[PDB]
A paper describes a structure:
Kelch repeat and BTB domain-containing protein 4 ([name]) is the substrate receptor of a cullin3-dependent E3 ligase complex (CRL3KBTBD4). Recurrent indel mutations in the Kelch domain of the [name] E3 ligase rewire epigenetic programs for stemness in medulloblastoma by recruiting LSD1-CoREST-[name]/2 complexes as neo-substrates for ubiquitination and degradation. [name], an investigational drug for haematopoietic stem cell transplantation, was found to degrade LSD1-CoREST-[name]/2 complexes in a wild-type [name]-dependent manner, suggesting a potential common mode of action. The mutant and drug-induced complexes adopt similar structural assemblies requiring both Kelch domains in the [name] dimer for each [name] interaction.
To determine the structure of the lower affinity KBTBD4WT complex mediated by [name], we used the BS3 crosslinker to stabilise the binding of the CoREST1NT2-[name] neo-substrate. This sample yielded 2:2 and 2:1 KBTBD4WT-[name]-[name] complexes at 2.9 Å and 3.1 Å, respectively. No such density was found in the 2:2 complex, likely due to steric constraints that would prevent CoREST1 binding in this higher order assembly. The cryo-EM datasets for the KBTBD4WT-[name]-[name] complexes yielded 2:1 and 2:2 models displaying an RSMD value of 1.55 Å across 1055 Cα positions. Superposition of the 2:1 and 2:2 states shows that the high structural conservation extends across the protein-compound and protein-protein interaction sites, indicating that the neo-substrate recruitment mechanism in these complexes is conserved regardless of the stoichiometry. [name] is buried in the site 1 interfaces where it forms contacts with blades II and III from the KBTBD4WT Kelch domain, as well as with the [name] catalytic pocket. The methyl tetrazole inserts into the [name] catalytic pocket to form extensive interactions, including a hydrogen bond with [name] Y304 and π–π interactions with [name] F151, F206 and H179. The binding is further stabilised by π–π interactions between the buried [name] pyrimidoindole core and [name] residues F151 and F206. Outside of the [name] catalytic pocket, [name] forms hydrophobic interactions with KBTBD4WT I310 and P311 from the BC II loop and L356 located at the tip of the BC III loop. Site 1 superposition reveals that [name] mimics the mutated BC II loop of KBTBD4R313PRR by engaging the same [name] residues in its catalytic pocket.
Residue numbers in the entry:
A (entry chain D), D (entry chain B): 11 to 332, 342 to 348, 351 to 373
B (entry chain C), C (entry chain A): 29 to 92, 101 to 158, 172 to 190, 252 to 259, 286 to 319, 326 to 472, 482 to 489, 492 to 500, ...
The structure:
């Protein structure tokens, strides 16, 4: 029941020399397709480039009117608004900045629509995973936030949606965009403490009618699979039974594994394959997006088998010519009496 | 036990009194001598009890009219002034003369201090002097003395450090990226700006004490990087948050100098503070001594002392053991090897023996 | 001056050595006596130099075969053990005997310590003993000893304090409101929960050290209220943030005991710490001594000591000057007046001399 | 040009025994009218009770549907939403909770409409001044935020509005309701540092397109008029010339004077009369609302002459029988080199 959405030329927009984020992450991910049998058993599609009218449902119209203008030129005129939208320094400006994000969110809402008509029950669009962007500004190399648009698309057909993010960085925009609403359940497993987002603490949960409608797991350095899976599975096992939901969204950040640049965690090969697999047992409809990921080699090799675990067919460890596809899981400051404490805190918060 | 029936009353003032009264009642108003010492015909009324209690040779000597030859009168006067008052204003002229006799007369403290003096200014049963002399072999007649900032490193740099030849520079597009110019490293798992990158070889590792956060707050956190395993582990925090502070290592201990501190609950004021991190005990403390010069200082380590330069042509020596400053006279940055001051506003080695200088930007360290 | 030519080398170890060697070479391996002391026929080889350096009476005595009458042999043995080793395990039986002679022989430290002993356990030129004896006039044959929690005070209470009869309670609908039950006050200009409300009469004021914030963070801030002008001024901050810690005053100094501290960057763990705020110098420090009992402790001040109760029937004495604990044996709360332990879970005065107790909730203070 | 709006029975809704906020503050304020000549020279009006349809322009419909239900009863049923809207503990529930706020915002928008037709150029409605409330929750005894509704009313006729608050507590809702927008300039002079709002620091200014469109002045204890006026006047003198605005809103908190319960500042009689007077010189249209204020005696005596200074006629110091009407201005931790530092910081931020 796999309907895999692959953008034809997503990996054609450069991001900068020696720049952390790499739009080639998704190309090298699926570009083991020259000897990939699963594609015969998979329905491959192409995404429809989303228009500004669909994107302005949440983003302020001025933001979209701004976004469709930037280029390697046309910066001096907008230098008074470039600093009013946070673009330029952290999230830079590259060629086709209004094309890559537009097509990614188009694919995301295409999968959302496909699930909306009960056509299929699982849909993956690895070109999503931009959860940092906000209503009026961009942050964390995320200009257009696909997750929020997909959730808005599902908000009418379904009244209860999950967002599960195992990305190292906290999902702020994907949480602020529905903070006050009581319809969406956001869950993020992030490193707190003088890290990038600076938010998503243990205490910043809910707002007004959206009170308690959020879950944050602040981890630390050197987490391992033997504890990460045991601390991760019961959170969904509890939230699903306590939310009586309709559909889920699976943001799978592949920067949360070993050897990743800017990646503090250290997860094994099969340790990562517990979010894309244990989520399937719940039998609910599911979007699947991919977020940030660096160290192209490992972020792609580990990504190869995410689809396989999402479709339930084992891919032999000896991969094609297109070295091996195995990794290792240093110290672990995540004391068991600390992770257990946070797990109990989350369990007590959800029961409220 | 119960203080209302019986308890042990130990006092730290007793030592101070049994020192001060002893000092006051011998060098002045000589009394209870009971011994007469001959120093090339000079008659001394050296009291018996005080001696032998520090020099065992005098115990052996006075275990049931003396000669004590092969001793300089002035050096013996200095020795008596020590043994009686504990304070001696030593000079380089009378160093070796005060050295050999002191190792003879079982004076551990003076032995150590003259060994340190000889190792600093450049035979007996001590290793410190022998190792110090052996280390002075590069000039008896392989690595760059100091690493500037020939490479380019176009990536933006906000911190650098050395570990013996391996230039580990924090930088890149995102500062967490760590570049190695030995002859890449584990990502820094913290968002820091103006963090002090100490490199203590005694417990070989790289420490990132202090810094600023993305929320514009001062980071009182220390995280260390193990060299042999690329493990960015975390250690005990600091006592006072700082940023852009000078750092210098000395026999394991890491000294954090100056920087900026939290002022008026919202801003940063230049600080004049001394912080010590014991890379063996893993404990932090703040020394009561306060630097005369505050601001953005750069420190260098020379022998057993540390030169500090903050603002202007005034360099401030610092002996951690003696807790005293020399305050010599002459934005600069001091680099001590084989000292040398470099001017930041580039619009020259130093000799500290006579305070005489010879004449011959981002991160000089 | 310049360390490479000449400098002053002062050592704090010199006093320690001139104490330890003196102690080791008299009480054992007696040598260089030079004096013979008669104590009811007991012959003592008391060395001359050590004496007179602490007791001026022995200086006068030995300024160019002794009697020294009107002295107890055992008390003189104790005196010699002091003068030679500084450590004496005094007992209540030999207090007065060791007192009168010590004021005679110009022993300031022992004079003070026996004066403190007599003032604690209950003629000469000292005021401390005279004032202590005068203060013991309430029992030679006006104010409530301790204020419970007869009024109602329906307003919610989170902290209270006493200043001699004026029950100043933080509370109300909003905690900042301050109610006075003397025999209203300036609003507290801070949002605090579980703040320590000390009342130091020496610099008469009310201090609000420590607390929790509305953002669920620990407050390392001290703000004081001047009694005579209703001025909620602000003083120097603490060193470690705490909340719900016990507080006790002693001759100006304010001692902050235990409480909760920041654990794992998000939670609060029970703490066993000693903090001192000098209400005259306006400086804070943390004592190296750590309480054996941690948690939610309640402290009371008795004479020159502090009783602390944390969890169970074990009370922990604390002498701030001696930095030692008695650790007697027997959630409770200690209230020391004229001591008395009260059980919080109410589902009895104390005598510390023999650790014997007699038998006869929100904020007992 | 005075058009004074006085609610007939605003002071008829109790707030609780020994409770800090007192709805009688506004009654005793104008209830020196038995010998108050200025009323003959003033046009007194009555406010129209605002309907829910007008209030739901910003507040979420669920919030207003909730608000019109609470009473001394009907609490157990909403006990699951009472904690989802922050009501009950800090901001309690009293009789006519949906009447006092409704009439106050009705008067506020009545003054807004009167200024909107160029009828008059100054309008005072002391029943406003609820700037703590938020889109989905209530805070600081503020259920319905009148300022936000008035600013929304003016947002169509005028494209640039000021909000100036000299209340001790930071104005959060009046700032969050237009945080991302670039149309309204908010300015609040508050005590920061473990105080009630916990927000409005020196650094929390702007959001996205609303970047730098906010101004926060964190003061400290024991401020005096001789420095407060000198530090206060140039802020408006700069912001007006730098904003090219249309209309202003003057939130006048009378808890910012001496002897006030929960009031740390210490201001004199004529020291307070520099916001209601120096604002008039700018010649722009102005709303005038009154915020929190306690210690009924002083908060009313000092309020008596605010209207007089707003109309430019001196009222003799010997007031009627309906003791004196004079106060005093302890220590001052507001170091001049700190207030000067913050003033320079604000001046440099506004120029951006
Ligand atoms: C998903 N993801 N992957 N990588 C990142 C990411 C992206 C960016 C940064 C980052 C991580 N860590 C960082 N640390 C610093 C150090 C610093 C501390 C205190 C004050 C200033 C700077 N500055 C960063 N950028 C600045 C932000 C302000 C802007 N005006 C210029 C660019 C970033 N997110
Ligand atoms: C314009 N204006 N005038 N006065 C106020 C105002 C209003 C309220 C408070 C306040 C000031 N200061 C306060 N301090 C505390 C102490 C505290 C510290 C840390 C954790 C908890 C409490 N708790 C307050 N209320 C609680 C809030 C949580 C709720 N569950 C119960 C009620 C308030 N606003
Ligand atoms: Zn990420
Ligand atoms: Zn207020």
């Amino acid at each position: 029941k796999v309907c895999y959405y692959y953008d034809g030329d997503i990996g054609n927009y450069y991001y900068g020399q020696g720049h952390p984020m790499k739009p080639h992450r998704i190309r090298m991910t699926h570009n083991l397709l020259l000897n990939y049998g699963l594609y015969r058993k998979m329905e491959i599609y192409r995404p429809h480039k989303a228009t500004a009218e669909e994107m302005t449902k949440y983003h302020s119209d001025e933001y979209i009117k701004f976004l469709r203008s930037i280029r390697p030129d046309n910066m001096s005129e907008y230098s008074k608004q470039m600093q009013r939208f946070n673009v330029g320094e952290d999230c830079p400006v590259f060629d086709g900045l209004f094309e890559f994000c537009q097509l990614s969110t188009g694919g995301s809402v295409a999968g959302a629509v496909k699930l909306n008509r009960q056509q299929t029950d699982m849909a993956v669009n690895w070109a999503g995973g931009l959860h940092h962007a906000k209503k009026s500004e961009a942050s964390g190399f995320c200009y257009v936030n696909d997750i929020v648009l997909a959730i808005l698309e599902l908000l009418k057909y379904h009244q209860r949606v999950l967002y599960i993010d195992i990305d190292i960085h906290h999902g702020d925009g994907v949480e602020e965009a529905f903070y006050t609403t009581d319809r969406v359940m956001t869950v993020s497993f992030h490193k707190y403490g003088e890290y990038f987002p600076g938010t998503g603490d243990l205490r910043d949960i809910g707002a007004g009618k959206g009170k308690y409608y959020a879950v944050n797991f602040p981890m630390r350095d050197g987490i391992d699979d033997e504890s990460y899976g045991q601390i991760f599975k019961p959170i969904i096992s509890k939230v699903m039974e306590m939310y009586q939901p309709s559909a889920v969204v699976l943001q799978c950040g592949a920067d949360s594994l070993s050897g990743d640049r800017l990646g503090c965690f250290n997860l094994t090969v099969k340790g990562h394959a517990k979010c894309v697999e244990v989520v399937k047992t719940f039998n609910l409809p599911l979007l699947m997006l991919g977020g940030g990921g660096y160290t192209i080699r490992n972020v792609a090799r580990c990504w190869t088998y995410e689809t396989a675990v999402a479709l339930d067919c084992e891919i032999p460890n000896e991969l094609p010519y297109n070295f091996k596809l195995h990794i290792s899981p240093m110290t672990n400051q995540n004391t068991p009496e600390y992770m257990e404490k946070i797990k109990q805190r989350l369990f007590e918060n959800l029961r409220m | 036990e119960n203080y209302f029936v019986n308890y042990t009353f130990k006092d730290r003032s007793h030592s101070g009194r049994v020192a001060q009264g002893i000092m006051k009642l011998c060098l002045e108003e000589e009394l209870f001598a009971d011994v007469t010492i001959s120093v090339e015909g000079r008659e001394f009324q050296l009291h018996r009890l005080v001696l032998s209690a520090q020099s065992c040779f005098f115990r052996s000597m006075f275990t049931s009219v003396i000669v004590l030859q092969d001793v300089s009168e002035s050096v013996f006067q200095l020795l008596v002034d020590y043994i009686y008052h504990g304070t001696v204003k030593l000079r380089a002229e009378e160093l070796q003369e005060i050295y050999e006799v002191s190792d003879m007369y079982q004076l551990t403290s003076l032995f150590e201090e003259c060994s340190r003096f000889l190792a600093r200014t450049v035979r007996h049963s001590d290793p410190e002097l022998y190792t110090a002399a052996k280390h002075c072999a590069k000039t008896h007649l392989e690595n760059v003395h100091i690493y500037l900032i020939q490479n380019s490193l176009c990536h933006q740099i906000t911190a650098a450090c050395k570990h013996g030849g391996d230039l580990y520079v924090v930088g890149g597009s995102i500062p967490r990226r760590m570049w190695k110019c030995n002859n890449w490293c584990a990502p820094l798992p913290r968002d820091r700006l103006q963090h002090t990158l100490v490199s203590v070889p005694g417990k070989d590792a790289i420490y990132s004490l202090g810094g600023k956060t993305l929320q514009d707050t001062l980071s009182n956190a220390v995280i260390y990087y193990r060299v042999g395993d690329n493990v960015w582990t975390e250690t005990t925090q600091l006592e006072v948050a700082v940023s852009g502070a000078a750092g210098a290592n000395l026999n394991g201990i890491i000294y954090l100098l100056g920087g900026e501190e939290n002022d008026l609950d919202f801003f940063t004021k230049p600080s004049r503070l001394i912080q010590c991190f014991d890379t063996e005990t893993d404990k932090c403390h703040v020394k009561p001594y306060v630097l005369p010069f505050a601001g953005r200082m750069h420190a260098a380590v020379h022998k057993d002392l540390v030169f500090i330069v903050a603002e202007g042509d005034s360099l401030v020596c610092y002996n951690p053991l003696l807790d005293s400053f020399t305050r010599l006279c002459l934005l600069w940055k001091i680099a001590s090897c084989n000292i040398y001051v470099f001017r930041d506003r580039y619009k020259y080695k130093l000799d500290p023996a006579t305070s005489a200088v010879t004449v011959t930007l981002q991160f000089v360290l």
